[PDB]
Design a protein around this ligand. Structure first.
Ligand SMILES: [Ca+2]
Ligand SMILES: [Cl-]
Length: 123
């Protein structure tokens, strides 16, 4: 769920408020997403969007009524490392992995201020 993803991103980027810093960035970070990613951070978000689309194709996922944004899962942050839990069932586990991958991705790419609040004439 979005509460968990926020925490993951803070795990990797402890100075951030991710729901502010990483929402409405580029063509893909935030609601929806199309066009060409503007930079590597935007590409992290495209991958994550694709991961959530692939979570929904899962037979596993077609039961929790929640979407990936509302589907809770279990994870830990420890020493700024994210660990998804073996106690997660299949849908939960898949979404946790999508989120972990994206949080790590965000932490390893440049942040270009020019793309924050981009006009979706670029997308
Ligand atoms: Ca998106
Ligand atoms: Cl990690």
């Amino acid at each position: 769920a979005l509460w968990q993803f926020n925490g993951m991103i803070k795990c990797k980027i402890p100075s951030s408020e991710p729901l502010l810093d990483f929402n409405n960035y580029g063509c893909y970070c935030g609601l929806g997403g199309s066009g060409t990613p503007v930079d590597d951070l935007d590409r992290c978000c495209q991958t994550h969007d694709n991961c959530y689309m692939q979570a929904m194709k899962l037979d596993s996922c077609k039961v929790l009524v929640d979407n990936p944004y509302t589907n809770n899962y279990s994870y830990s942050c420890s020493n700024n490392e994210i660990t998804c839990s073996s106690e997660n069932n299949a849908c939960e586990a898949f979404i946790c992995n999508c989120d972990r991958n994206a949080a790590i991705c965000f932490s390893k790419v440049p942040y270009n201020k020019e793309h924050k609040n981009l006009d979706k004439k670029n997308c």
